Write a protein that binds this ligand. Structure first.
Ligand SMILES: NCc1ccccn1
Ligand SMILES: NCc1ccccn1
Ligand SMILES: [Mg+2]
Length: 124
């Protein structure tokens, strides 16, 4: 089963802005070093390995972000954003990580800015 979280649906954020996305809806853009977004109430119904996909774009090299649960109580890992050659040239990167069942605040934190994100998809 899959859960799709629209990236623009965050409850809290720092130093980002929403913009119309070429794939419909909105994406988060104007992401800098130290920008972040937080999504409450993300349910992982079983304990085990999940695929977490990120629909991202960048016209530059080096965009990088970390994902975490509960404000860094559990770090899930870090994602590099490819240089897809345009701000609306989208691609899907992923991480495979182990989470125990629960409902968590899910956080994305920009280590190196210059990347956009459309959505997050979680699959077990
Ligand atoms: N965990 C992403 C984040 C960072 C700072 C504050 C809230 N959430
Ligand atoms: N050059 C646009 C931009 C601004 C802030 C963050 C990332 N890209
Ligand atoms: Mg979106």
């Amino acid at each position: 089963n899959t859960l799709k979280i629209e990236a623009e649906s965050y409850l809290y954020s720092n130093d980002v802005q929403k913009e119309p996305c070429s794939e419909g809806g909105e994406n988060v853009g104007y992401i800098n070093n130290g920008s972040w977004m937080s999504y409450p109430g993300i349910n992982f119904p079983s304990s085990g390995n999940y695929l977490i996909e990120y629909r991202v774009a960048s016209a530059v090299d080096g965009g990088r972000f970390s994902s975490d649960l509960e404000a860094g109580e559990t770090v899930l890992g870090e994602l590099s954003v490819p240089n897809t050659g345009g701000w609306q040239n989208w691609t899907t990167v992923s991480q495979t990580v182990n989470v125990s069942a629960g409902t968590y605040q899910f956080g994305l934190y920009s280590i190196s800015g210059g990347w956009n994100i459309n959505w997050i998809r979680i699959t077990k």
